Amino acid sequence: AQKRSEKQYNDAQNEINKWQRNAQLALQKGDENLARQALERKKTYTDTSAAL
């Protein structure tokens, strides 16, 4: 269970990193709404990670 939670936590961190890259990419793309959405998703992921 500890390993599974760690894996989930690791996945969340990986997802957050991917999201951060996407958010930066969105700004380059010029889609303001998408970047904002990614930030919101990151917060949710962070909350999940904190809970884990």
Place this chain on the structure above:
Amino acid sequence: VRGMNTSSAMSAFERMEEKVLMQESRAQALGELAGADLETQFAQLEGGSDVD
């Protein structure tokens, strides 16, 4: 012409429109719910990164 109870044209139009409207609207609405996912909008950005 005035539309007595089972006037075949008028009565058929009613019965078809019941199906026609429900099915088409379900498909559009459920299609928008299936298309609602944020990661799918990220797949449009990913397609932009991939083509560039």
Place this chain on the structure above:
Amino acid sequence: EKMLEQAILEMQEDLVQLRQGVAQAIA
């Protein structure tokens, strides 16, 4: 595990029904 497992299956089916209702409202 038994109390928890039954609940998870039940919530998912309910969500699908809710989505259909939302679609009808949208329609």
Place this chain on the structure above:
Amino acid sequence: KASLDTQSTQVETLKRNLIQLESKISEAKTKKEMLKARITTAKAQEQLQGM
């Protein structure tokens, strides 16, 4: 002539009622659509209770 006049007033009332009825049936159809939407909303509330 007297009979015709009495009959004519009744006929006018009937015609007026029919016109009103035509307007009313359309309204009833609209009401059903409104009623259907509220019921769907109620169902969503029930789902929350289940959770």
